[PDB]
Design a protein around this ligand. Structure first.
Ligand SMILES: *[C@@H]1O[C@H](CO)[C@@H](O)[C@H](O)[C@H]1NC(C)=O
Ligand SMILES: *[C@@H]1O[C@H](CO)[C@@H](O)[C@H](O)[C@H]1NC(C)=O
Ligand SMILES: *[C@@H]1O[C@H](CO)[C@@H](O)[C@H](O)[C@H]1NC(C)=O
Ligand SMILES: *[C@@H]1O[C@H](CO)[C@@H](O)[C@H](O)[C@H]1NC(C)=O
Ligand SMILES: *[C@@H]1O[C@H](CO)[C@@H](O)[C@H](O)[C@H]1NC(C)=O
Ligand SMILES: *[C@@H]1O[C@H](CO)[C@@H](O)[C@H](O)[C@H]1NC(C)=O
Ligand SMILES: *[C@@H]1O[C@H](CO)[C@@H](O)[C@H](O)[C@H]1NC(C)=O
Ligand SMILES: *[C@@H]1O[C@H](CO)[C@@H](O)[C@H](O)[C@H]1NC(C)=O
Ligand SMILES: *[C@@H]1O[C@H](CO)[C@@H](O)[C@H](O)[C@H]1NC(C)=O
Lengths: 166, 420, 55, 148, 50
C-alpha cells in the first residue's frame, strides 16, 4: 500500500483480524503497521487553492495572496480570516463598503498606498423617529431618471459538424 | 386503492337579483418559503482526475483544455450564488432600527423582531427555522460573502423600516407613520374604509397576534415546512457523493487506484490504464458540471422570484390576485432561512356572508340613480347603500349616488325614494 | 425436522474496518427465514454450510 | 464605460466559447499528430484509422460540450428577453403600480432606447423630498360625531 | 368564500375597474352581450377552420 499523507495515532478499535480500514467513499484512511501491529491513521496533507487580490494593473503593482482553506501555520503581514490565511494586506478596525469581496463578510480595498482587509459595512444606521401620534409628509419632489439595461439576443452562429471534425 | 377526490361539490346559489356580502373578517397570516442560493463548491479537475501523479497529468494535457472550462463554470456558479443572495436581501439603503418603545397600537411583533439576548439579530422564528433544518479529493466548499449575521441584520432593517415608515422607505426617505394609520391606508387599498379598522382595532390586533402564535406553533411542531430547502441540500449532497463514489470504478483498467497502476507497470504499459481512468473520471466530472449548471439556473429563477416578491410585497402592497397569500394583501414580513427566505403574508379574508336582494339602480322622479361607490341592497322592506366588501348599510342619499339617464333603459331598476 | 433460519448466519465478508457505514455486499450468505434441518448422516455440502450447535 | 456590463459580459462569453472550440481543434487527443492531413499522408488506412478515430472522439466530445453550454446560455438569454418584453409592455405602454418593477420610487413613464444586443429603459420616477414633522390624529370629534 | 353576484353587476364592477362608469354597461347591456356572443362565435369559427 503506497500513498502520501500524515500518520497519527488512532483510536479506531480494529478487531484482531482486520488490517485495513475504509472511510466513506471507499478510501483507505487507517492502516496497521506490519511489525508493531500499531493502528495508524492516514489523512491527506494540507492543500488548497491560492488567490491573488489585485487593485488593478495601472493603479498599483502590489498584491495580496490568499491561501484558501489553509491554516497560517503552513507557509509581509499575515492575517487569519474565515477563508484561509491572508498575506500582504493589513487589518483595519474600520468598516467600508465592499470593494473586493474575499469571503465570510470580509472585503479588501486599496486605500491610503496599501491593501487593507476589513469587515464590510452593510450601510448607515438610520433610526426612524417613530411615534404613535406624529407623521412626516413631503413638501417638495425631485423627479429622477434612471436606466436599466437588459440583453435580449445573442449572435446567431452555426457550426458545421462534419467540416469541424474532418 | 381508490379514485382520488378533486374536492367538495359546492354549488353557489346564483340568482339574478340576490347577492351575498360579508359581515365580518378573519385576518390570516401564512408563510411562503423560497430557496435563494446553493453551497459554493469548486472542484479541482487535475487533483480529482490525477491528484499527484505527474505521468497522469502529462497524459491529461493531451486532452486539451477541458479542466479550465470546468473550473470556469464552477467559478461562475459560485459568483452567481453570491449575486442571488445579494439581490434578494441587499435592497435597503440604510440599516433602520425599531424604536425602543413598542406602542404599535396593540400589534405584537416580539416574535419576529430581533432579540438582544438571542445570537446576533436572529429572532425567535428565525431561530426555529435555523434549528428545523436537519477533507476530500480536490473538493472545496467556499464560504458565502454574506454571513448569516449580515443577512439577519438586513432582514431586521427591512422589518423595522416596514413597521415604522410603512411603504414610504421603499421609494424615498423613511417617512414615519403610526401603525394604526398605516393599517387604515392598507385597508383603503383593498377597498374597505378606514373606519372599519379604527372601530375594530383591538379585534384586528388580537387576530393578528393569534395568527402569529399559530404560525410559530406550526413551525415548531411540524418539521415538513422547509421541504424546498431540504430538497436542495439533499440534491447537492447526492451529487457530491456520486462524484466521490465515481472516483472508485475500474473503468476497464487493471485497478481503480492510480498509485498501484504506477507501481506495478512500466510507463508504456501503464499509459493504457491511466488513459482509461482519465477518460472515465473526465466524463464523470463533465456530467457533474452540467447537472450543477442546470440546478444553478433553476435556483437563479427561484432567487429572481424571491427578490420580486420582496420588492413588491414587503416594500409595498400588491394588487396581484394571488402573488402573496390567498385573499386581499395587507402586508408581508421577511424572515431569514439557511439558504432561503420566508415571507409571512398578512391577508384580509372576508367571512360570515349574508344573503341580500340587490338592484342595479333606483328610480326616483323618473331619474336613474347609481351608487357612487358600493352596491344597493335590501333587508326585505328597506333599501340601503353598503360597500361591496363589508356590511355597513347607509340611507340612500344624493351625496352617495349619482344620477344619469332615465328609468327606461336599465333592466331591473326598482321603485324607491332618495333623501336629500 | 425443520426450523426457520431467522436472522442467523451473518459474518464479516472482507476483513476490512468500517465504522458508521451501511455497506452493501454480495457473497454466499444464509437467506433469512430459510429452512434449516434440525437433528449423523451424510450431508450434501453445497458451497457453504451454516453449522450451529447448542450445549 | 461600465454601464453596459451585461452586454459586454454576453459578448465575452460567446467569444470565449468560440475561441475554446477553435483551440480545441489542436490537441493530439492521443493520436500521432493533431493535424489530419499528415496522419493520412504518413500511414496506411488500416494503421491510420486508429489515430483518425482518436481525433474524431476528441473533437466530437468538444463539440458536444460547446452545444450544451450554448443551450444553457440560450435559456438564460430567453429568460432575460422575456423579462425585457414584459418590462416594455407594462412600463412603456402604460404605468405600472408594481413597487420596484421600473426604477425606485413612484413610476411616471419610461422611454426605450436601442442597444447592440439589448434594450435600455429610461425610467422617469417621482420621488418625494423635503419631509416635515407633523402631529396627526385618526379622526375628529364634532358634536359627538367621528369624522374621517 | 363564494359570494354570489348577478352577472350584470359583476360586469358593472369590472367596468368600474378600467375607469368607465357602470351606467355605460347598464345602458348598453344588450349591445355588450351581442358583441360578446359574436366574439365567442368568431373564436369558435377560427378554431374550427384554421
Ligand atoms: C487606469 O485605468 C482606468 C480604467 O482602465 C482609466 O480610467 C484610468 O484613466 C487609467 N489611468 C491611467 C493613469 O492610465
Ligand atoms: C492553526 O495552527 C496553530 C498552530 O498549530 C493552532 O494553534 C491553531 O489552532 C490552528 N488553527 C485552527 C483553526 O485549528
Ligand atoms: C483594532 O482592534 C484590535 C483588536 O481589538 C486592537 O488590538 C487594535 O488596537 C485596534 N486598533 C485600533 C487602531 O483601534
Ligand atoms: C407579545 O407576545 C409575547 C408572547 O407571545 C409576550 O411575552 C409579550 O409580552 C407580548 N408583547 C407585549 C407588548 O405584551
Ligand atoms: C343564501 O340563500 C341560498 C338560497 O337562496 C342558500 O343556498 C344559501 O345557503 C344562503 N346563504 C346564506 C349565507 O344565508
Ligand atoms: C329592515 O331595516 C329597517 C330599518 O329601517 C327596519 O325597520 C325593518 O324592520 C327591517 N326589515 C327586516 C325584515 O328586518
Ligand atoms: C330575474 O329573473 C326573474 C325570473 O327569472 C324575472 O322575473 C326578473 O325580472 C329578473 N330580474 C332581473 C333584474 O333580471
Ligand atoms: C315604479 O316602478 C314600476 C315598475 O314596476 C313603474 O310603474 C314605474 O317605474 C314606477 N312607478 C311610478 C314612477 O309611478
Ligand atoms: C422629526 O422629529 C424627530 C424627533 O421627534 C427628529 O429625529 C427628526 O429629525 C425630525 N425630522 C424632521 C424632518 O424634522
Amino acid at each position: 500500500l503506497t500513498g502520501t499523507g500524515v500518520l497519527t495515532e488512532s483510536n479506531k478499535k480494529f478487531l484482531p483480524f482486520q488490517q485495513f480500514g475504509r472511510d466513506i467513499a471507499d478510501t483507505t484512511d487507517a492502516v496497521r503497521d506490519p511489525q508493531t501491529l500499531e493502528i495508524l491513521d492516514i489523512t491527506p496533507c494540507s492543500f488548497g487553492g491560492v488567490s491573488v487580490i489585485t487593485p488593478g494593473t495601472n493603479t498599483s503593482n502590489q498584491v495580496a495572496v490568499l491561501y484558501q482553506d489553509v491554516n497560517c501555520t503552513e507557509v509581509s503581514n499575515v492575517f487569519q480570516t474565515r477563508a484561509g490565511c491572508l498575506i500582504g494586506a493589513e487589518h483595519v478596525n474600520n468598516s467600508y463598503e465592499c470593494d473586493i469581496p474575499i469571503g465570510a463578510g470580509i472585503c479588501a480595498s486599496y486605500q491610503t498606498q496599501s491593501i487593507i482587509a476589513y469587515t464590510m459595512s452593510l450601510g448607515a444606521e438610520n433610526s426612524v423617529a417613530y411615534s404613535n401620534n406624529s407623521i412626516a409628509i413631503p413638501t417638495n419632489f425631485t423627479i429622477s431618471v434612471t436606466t436599466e439595461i437588459l440583453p435580449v439576443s445573442m449572435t446567431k452562429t452555426s457550426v458545421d459538424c462534419t467540416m469541424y471534425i474532418c | 386503492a381508490y379514485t382520488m377526490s378533486l374536492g367538495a361539490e359546492n354549488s353557489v346559489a346564483y340568482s339574478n337579483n340576490s347577492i351575498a356580502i360579508p359581515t365580518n373578517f378573519t385576518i390570516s397570516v401564512t408563510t411562503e418559503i423560497l430557496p435563494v442560493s446553493m453551497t459554493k463548491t469548486s472542484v479541482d479537475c487535475t487533483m480529482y482526475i490525477c491528484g499527484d501523479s505527474t505521468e497522469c497529468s502529462n497524459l491529461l494535457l493531451q486532452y486539451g483544455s477541458f479542466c479550465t472550462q470546468l473550473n470556469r463554470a464552477l467559478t461562475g456558479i459560485a459568483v452567481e450564488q453570491d449575486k442571488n443572495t445579494q439581490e434578494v436581501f441587499a435592497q435597503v439603503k440604510q440599516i433602520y432600527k425599531t424604536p425602543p418603545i413598542k406602542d404599535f397600537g396593540g400589534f405584537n411583533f416580539s416574535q419576529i423582531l430581533p432579540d438582544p439576548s438571542k445570537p446576533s439579530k436572529r429572532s425567535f422564528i428565525e431561530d426555529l427555522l435555523f434549528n428545523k433544518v436537519t477533507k476530500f479529493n480536490g473538493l472545496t466548499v467556499l464560504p458565502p460573502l454574506l454571513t448569516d449575521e449580515m443577512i439577519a441584520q438586513y432582514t431586521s432593517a427591512l422589518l423595522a423600516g416596514t413597521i415604522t415608515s410603512g411603504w414610504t422607505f421603499g421609494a424615498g426617505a423613511a417617512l414615519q407613520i403610526p401603525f394604526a394609520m398605516q393599517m387604515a391606508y392598507r385597508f383603503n387599498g383593498i377597498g374597505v374604509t378606514q373606519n372599519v379598522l379604527y372601530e375594530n382595532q383591538k379585534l384586528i390586533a388580537n387576530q393578528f397576534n393569534s395568527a402569529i402564535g399559530k404560525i410559530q406553533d406550526s413551525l415548531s411542531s411540524t418539521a415538513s415546512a422547509l421541504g424546498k430547502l431540504q430538497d436542495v441540500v439533499n440534491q447537492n449532497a447526492q451529487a457530491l457523493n456520486t462524484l466521490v463514489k465515481q472516483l472508485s470504478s475500474n473503468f476497464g483498467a487493471i485497478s481503480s487506484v492510480l498509485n498501484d497502476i504506477l507501481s506495478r507497470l512500466d510507463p508504456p504499459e501503464a499509459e493504457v490504464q491511466i488513459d482509461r481512468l482519465i477518460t472515465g473520471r473526465l466524463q464523470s466530472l463533465q456530467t457533474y458540471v452540467t447537472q450543477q449548471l442546470i440546478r444553478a439556473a433553476e435556483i437563479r429563477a427561484s432567487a429572481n422570484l424571491a427578490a420580486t416578491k420582496m420588492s413588491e410585497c414587503v416594500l409595498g402592497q400588491s394588487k396581484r390576485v394571488d402573488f402573496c397569500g390567498k385573499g386581499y394583501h395587507l402586508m408581508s414580513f421577511p424572515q431569514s432561512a439557511p439558504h432561503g427566505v420566508v415571507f409571512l403574508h398578512v391577508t384580509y379574508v372576508p367571512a360570515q356572508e349574508k344573503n341580500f336582494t340587490t338592484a342595479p339602480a333606483i328610480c326616483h322622479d323618473g331619474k336613474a340613480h347609481f351608487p357612487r361607490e358600493g352596491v344597493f341592497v335590501s333587508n326585505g322592506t328597506h333599501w340601503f347603500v353598503t360597500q361591496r366588501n363589508f356590511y355597513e348599510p347607509q340611507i340612500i342619499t344624493t351625496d352617495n349616488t349619482f344620477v344619469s339617464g332615465n328609468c327606461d333603459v336599465v333592466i331591473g331598476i326598482v321603485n324607491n325614494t332618495v333623501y336629500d | 425436522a425443520y426450523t426457520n433460519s431467522f436472522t442467523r448466519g451473518v459474518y464479516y465478508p472482507d476483513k476490512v474496518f468500517r465504522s458508521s457505514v451501511l455497506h452493501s455486499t454480495q457473497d454466499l450468505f444464509l437467506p433469512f427465514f430459510s429452512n434449516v434441518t434440525w437433528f449423523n448422516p451424510v450431508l450434501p455440502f453445497n458451497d457453504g454450510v451454516y453449522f450451529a450447535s447448542t450445549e
